[PDB]
Scaffold this active site. Sequence first.
Site, PDB file in Angstrom:
ATOM      1  CE  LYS A 206      -3.790  -2.017   2.805  1.00 10.01           C
ATOM      2  NZ  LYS A 206      -4.874  -1.909   1.800  1.00 10.01           N
ATOM      3  NE  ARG A 280     -11.454 -10.450  -2.179  1.00 10.64           N
ATOM      4  CZ  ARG A 280     -11.940  -9.655  -3.127  1.00 10.64           C
ATOM      5  NH1 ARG A 280     -12.464 -10.164  -4.230  1.00 10.64           N
ATOM      6  NH2 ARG A 280     -11.903  -8.342  -2.958  1.00 10.64           N
TER       7      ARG A 280
HETATM    8 CL   LIG Z   1     -10.586  -8.783   0.215  1.00 10.96          CL
HETATM    9 MN   LIG Z   2      -5.896  -5.541   2.048  1.00 14.57          MN
END
Ligand SMILES: [Cl-]
Ligand SMILES: [Mn+2]
Lengths: 426, 427, 429, 429
Positions: A206, A280
Amino acid sequence: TEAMKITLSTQPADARWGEKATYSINNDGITLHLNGADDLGLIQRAARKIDGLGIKHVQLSGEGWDADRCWAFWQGYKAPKGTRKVVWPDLDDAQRQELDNRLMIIDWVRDTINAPAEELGPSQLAQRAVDLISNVAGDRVTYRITKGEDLREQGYMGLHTVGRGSERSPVLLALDYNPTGDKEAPVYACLVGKGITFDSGGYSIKQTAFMDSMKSDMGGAATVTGALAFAITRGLNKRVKLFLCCADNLISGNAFKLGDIITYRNGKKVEVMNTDAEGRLVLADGLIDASAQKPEMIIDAATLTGAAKTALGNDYHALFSFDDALAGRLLASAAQENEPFWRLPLAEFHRSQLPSNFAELNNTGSAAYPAGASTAAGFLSHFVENYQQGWLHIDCSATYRKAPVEQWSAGATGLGVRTIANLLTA
Amino acid sequence: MTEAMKITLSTQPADARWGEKATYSINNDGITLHLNGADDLGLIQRAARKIDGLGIKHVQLSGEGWDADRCWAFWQGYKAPKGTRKVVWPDLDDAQRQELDNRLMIIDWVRDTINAPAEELGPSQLAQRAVDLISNVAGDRVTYRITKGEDLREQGYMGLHTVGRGSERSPVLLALDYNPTGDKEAPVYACLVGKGITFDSGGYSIKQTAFMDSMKSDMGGAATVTGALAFAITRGLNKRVKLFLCCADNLISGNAFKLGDIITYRNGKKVEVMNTDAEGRLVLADGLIDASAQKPEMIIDAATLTGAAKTALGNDYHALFSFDDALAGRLLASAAQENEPFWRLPLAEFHRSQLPSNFAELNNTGSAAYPAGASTAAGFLSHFVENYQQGWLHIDCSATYRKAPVEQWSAGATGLGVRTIANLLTA
Amino acid sequence: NAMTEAMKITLSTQPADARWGEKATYSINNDGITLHLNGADDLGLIQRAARKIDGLGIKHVQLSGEGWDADRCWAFWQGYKAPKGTRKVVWPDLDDAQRQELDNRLMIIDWVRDTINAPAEELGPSQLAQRAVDLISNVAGDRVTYRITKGEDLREQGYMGLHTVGRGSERSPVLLALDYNPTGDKEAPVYACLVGKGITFDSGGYSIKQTAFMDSMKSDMGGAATVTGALAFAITRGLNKRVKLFLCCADNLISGNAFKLGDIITYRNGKKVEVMNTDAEGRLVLADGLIDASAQKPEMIIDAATLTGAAKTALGNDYHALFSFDDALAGRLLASAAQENEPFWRLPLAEFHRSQLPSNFAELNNTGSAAYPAGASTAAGFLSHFVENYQQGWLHIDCSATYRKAPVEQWSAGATGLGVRTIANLLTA
Amino acid sequence: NAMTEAMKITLSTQPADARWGEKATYSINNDGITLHLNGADDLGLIQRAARKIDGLGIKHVQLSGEGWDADRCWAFWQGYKAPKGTRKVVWPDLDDAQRQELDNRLMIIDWVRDTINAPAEELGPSQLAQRAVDLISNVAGDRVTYRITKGEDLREQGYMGLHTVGRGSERSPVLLALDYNPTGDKEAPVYACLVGKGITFDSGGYSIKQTAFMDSMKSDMGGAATVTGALAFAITRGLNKRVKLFLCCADNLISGNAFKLGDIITYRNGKKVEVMNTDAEGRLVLADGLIDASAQKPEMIIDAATLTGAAKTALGNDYHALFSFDDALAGRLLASAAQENEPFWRLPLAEFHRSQLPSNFAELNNTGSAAYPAGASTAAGFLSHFVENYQQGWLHIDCSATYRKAPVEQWSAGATGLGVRTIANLLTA
Ligand SMILES: [Cl-]
Ligand SMILES: [Mn+2]
Ligand SMILES: [Cl-]
Ligand SMILES: [Cl-]
Ligand SMILES: [Cl-]
Ligand SMILES: [Cl-]
Ligand SMILES: [Cl-]
Ligand SMILES: [Cl-]
Ligand SMILES: [Cl-]
Ligand SMILES: [Cl-]
Ligand SMILES: [Cl-]
Ligand SMILES: [Cl-]
Ligand SMILES: [Cl-]
Ligand SMILES: [Cl-]
Ligand SMILES: [Cl-]
Ligand SMILES: [Mn+2]
Ligand SMILES: [Mn+2]
Ligand SMILES: [Mn+2]
Ligand SMILES: [Zn+2]
Ligand SMILES: [Zn+2]
Ligand SMILES: [Zn+2]
Ligand SMILES: [Zn+2]
């Protein structure tokens, strides 16, 4: 550190402040000017300003103060740094008992999510979750913590692959609240929470501007843990199981790589085409465990995608489900608990909007399927055996405020705890 | 067991509904491929890809006109990393079938090994799978030596060790020796050198996700020279050839190599690292030193080295670099016999000094003033070959991997280069 | 300014003393500066020595002693010349042939360098077209005729490629159709057709460039200046055949009238092109010159253009990229490049590059994809759609060796002039 | 490369043979192509099959056999039609009611697809306004009247929003005020007001977009084409009430006259708006149309616009975003969307959104902040400042399903035409 009196009035402020002024000040103290439009929003917004005036000691005096109005003031008055004192007024036992439970459990969600990642690793999130629930659940609580290599040996390939890059091993908390004690009792609900204690994004690193608040990427796990504890204080008397998939998503000579194929215990193969879509991957393991219990309803919560925040801002939580009836029940609960939720799309076509050239599923979408939050929900449905009924997914877009707004200080809000608790005790 | 879809060949066009331009048509009997004699191998491959896109997972190559190449052309296009496909081959004769089965075994091994996720194929797995493929066809005529981790540092393999010490999977140097006569003093005919980066994050010079998502294929050079040696053996290679695979992961850790670090090689060269993502030439350097020590007749290094070669030739050709015009011409002559795409790019004496460093003899990266990335990389590698002016080929493998599916290729590895290098070794 | 004094520059096959270095290209004693040839690449060494002598602040030199021929003098000047400061060079005693050859290169190849180095403000489409006429008509005399089509007239006559690209600029786009016809016979067969990209400034259009890439885009008319000089130099070499020149001249700027992404240009040969990048404007203006070149049905068509960064990524600034389907003709241009000591390198062009520019709304796109990243090959493949007989007698030159954004071993900043001699050799060969 | 002969497309409830599989949506034998219906979603299956049949390169089809109707034929065509290539479709023997509905869709919805897919060069503000009048005049005859205000006239008459965005272009901004009045009576109450964002090309202004996000900005007038097509379709469905159309048409380009960040626009309703992002221009032009809409005191106001990428992030290209304060009216549009088989999803619009566009120099900002990242919701909140009674009778449609930058399962690249039937259905009910 002397107390400043806060009174409630239905009359407007004097012309020196204006007719629209929400609060005025004099020797008798601060006066909140209610107008009947949205008094809870007005009081919470007024509290945010009173904190901004450098007042650290207040007393709610005069008539009109109830649990909801006291709570509204505190929700807005509370800020991560500094010490604040609130002298509550004369409330009946039910009103004060409701306020105390909110203070104890919801501020625990605010403080846990706000806590630095160095203080709160996967292991600390697991044991603090057990402590919160054990303190209200009496003897009716059993738990199990599985960490590190044990997750690999038992097939939890999702949670292990994401966390193994960290020196703080990934943890699975499996907590069982069983009021009757009967070990055969049916599981009514399964809460599943994303506990990423810090998200660097992985090799898909990031930028600082987006990573500076990723200590809150475990906000889903804290929200369902609070929901269980708060539900118990509300009279929950049915069996509920809590699964927290906790891990750091960091960079090392051991972290997971792009192109790696994860094989889940249900046979699903997933190509990782972005290490930052890690939420996820770990939830999939919690959901497989949740489906195995065959509960009446499954509720998963997670600060999963930035697409939910582009759709709803920080003003609503995103609700995803195939079950229209169950979705309406949670929105009904959201209305009673005065918490913001908005339903975003989830249809069968989202289950194939994550194409991969090397595996059945991809953990990312594409330029052609840019509904990030809808496709993420579609990915999670491949890990719920009966996904068309009894399953809710909550993208917690309202869990964290990166900067103070009208009614919220910076950091975690604690929203979603009352709604989920209300649905559990409904 | 179901019903197979018949695939027949015709030198006549489709009916007025499909049009004269149609390359295939479907009637009651099955699918008919319409050849025109311009590029039938290319047309059949493009047709197989579209037959896969139709969802037809079971085909029978039916009727006359089929041979090793037309069957291989169909398979090359039909095969894809996902799904299961059954191909019933035609009644080929012994020799034709032997050549088809050799390509299926070895060239698809190159496609699957490069397509394999980094998690399942690390430096030690690559070296081991390479030994397995070659001993399966060589037998007792092949011996080898592995050298991994701290052993590389002690023995002065600073290039391979510095790039791979960042990974928790130790870097590996494979030194395989194919020796038919057994004579330990037999002359080494060819030295193959292959870049085996099992995963490239770029190191502290981190790549963006869009350019890293296919970096499991950064060991494509290693797989191609390995498959090339295996295929050469099935073609009757009867000369001593040594294979060197420099296998490692380029990852980020508290031990990963840093910008400004100077790597001292065994030949005296000092290289300043000014881009950790230019690691492929750092590991080949160690492979080329060992290749030169054997003082062979020819040296062939292969590597997925630069995005520059892909800007020059796309994914349509392999980049060939050399100071030896005669040898380069022989590889192009091999590529023409084996129907594989290769294009020669510039390599001159001036490229050897287009990697200036303020702190060392060589820099591992280029500059704005010298942006020919593939030529400056080939110029860097020339510093690690004693007789660089003769008997040395460098291949930037721009045609090894396809990030997305195209007309004649599914996504992933193509296997191109195996036949060309194999043909050059047997000529 | 104080009167500058000449510094004698001599040649020697003896190495410098130890104080300087084992293999030093130059040494400085009392009588002046000595260049130390070794027989490897004397032309390259002299040009590099010249560059360094400029860096010493020496503005006045005199090539004295024996050994100086046309190539060695030219080699020296090529490196000594820089766009800042004024430099005096006293030439040595040369025979009429050698001096005439040097004088021709000084007049024409430096014109290519100065014209390309000229600021966009001073060299708009009209100035480029007029200066090209001035150069050629100064060596051709009465054997040169020309027509200038500009502004609204290009639109009216169907030159949609050049008009659409240029209508964004206050300075109208210009098409130069110059004709060098020696025997005067208007029916004489056209031997060659030179086509040149003359973008006097490339902002990139709505596909606006980053400052670091636009700061040298005054040089986006190098191809135009290279083929113009090639004709002029070819004439001084005794070109006795008919050659037509086409310069597609325009500015690629941003206005309320500038062309837009998604626009479809309809050319006169019926081909429709979708613009999916206004910065791929080079191929849009060439297409119009290539149609005119094909119509004349010449023995060969040569086109030059500072077209893509893909060629500079493949060959750097060290070689011109050569594209052709004609192996025999490409062989002759490389044969010419060898005799003129200029660097060329052939990059790929195949029947499949013609379909590597897909569009969802038109037959052709003006840009490649992620799956087809060979920018210089797909660009050549785009140009082949505008040459009627593209498989025979056509050469595309992506002028990657035209401009140097920063000084190097043998070149100052700015245009190099490379390519003028090679095209000229091929025309007169 | 001529037109081929018809290939027969038949329907069947029997599945395909084993060679294709039993889940195959289509099979091909000597007789032609057969679509294998299962009853789950035959319109979706038929449309996805048509797309794959176009991919095989079949240019001439004939829908034959029993089982065809207006929806199944329209489904096949929705997927077969593509902006590239020439296609022919022989229709089956439908009855008059079925053939009348199919012909009305081919005429009006494919017009919406062709108009949005058209290049910005071919379709500027004046062309859009005129084609909109032509299409509605074709079906409405003399019951349609209109008024065009353009260029300097918009500035004079106080259309500062539409004029400020479009003045940067050489193609003048245009406001079309079309009136469909069936009863003739000039005092007739206006049932509905349609408002359409008609930006014929969005460069983003001085807040210039990148090439990747601008290459499809010829479609930024999708809202205009949608409400225009909707009124025309509504008339074919028997619309017998007064409906006014407002198309705010302009080019958002860069020039020496283009609007600048910090510029404050004063609207006719007194609202001051500070421009802090010239790429958020769609809402500035709709504000002028919404003021005209409200002034007519209509029963309902429907505005359509390709306004934000936030809607595409929230719903993809699979649904249109629906915003409204009116639950009942919002419920009526989703009911129409269900009857017309079109995808709509409601996104949040609440009082707090009207204050989520803070400015330090004016009552309103035209852009959102990091604190309020729901671009589509804040955009809707902004538009509400330009609707007199914003709490009743107003729908905003963010056309996130209007354009597909790349082909998908059921759609070719380009405009889909979705939204025409829904709006038309709501108006006629
Ligand atoms: Cl995700
Ligand atoms: Mn992430
Ligand atoms: Cl006030
Ligand atoms: Cl506090
Ligand atoms: Cl704060
Ligand atoms: Cl063949
Ligand atoms: Cl490298
Ligand atoms: Cl594929
Ligand atoms: Cl000078
Ligand atoms: Cl171009
Ligand atoms: Cl300079
Ligand atoms: Cl099937
Ligand atoms: Cl069509
Ligand atoms: Cl906008
Ligand atoms: Cl398309
Ligand atoms: Mn690298
Ligand atoms: Mn350009
Ligand atoms: Mn815009
Ligand atoms: Zn996360
Ligand atoms: Zn690499
Ligand atoms: Zn240009
Ligand atoms: Zn717009």
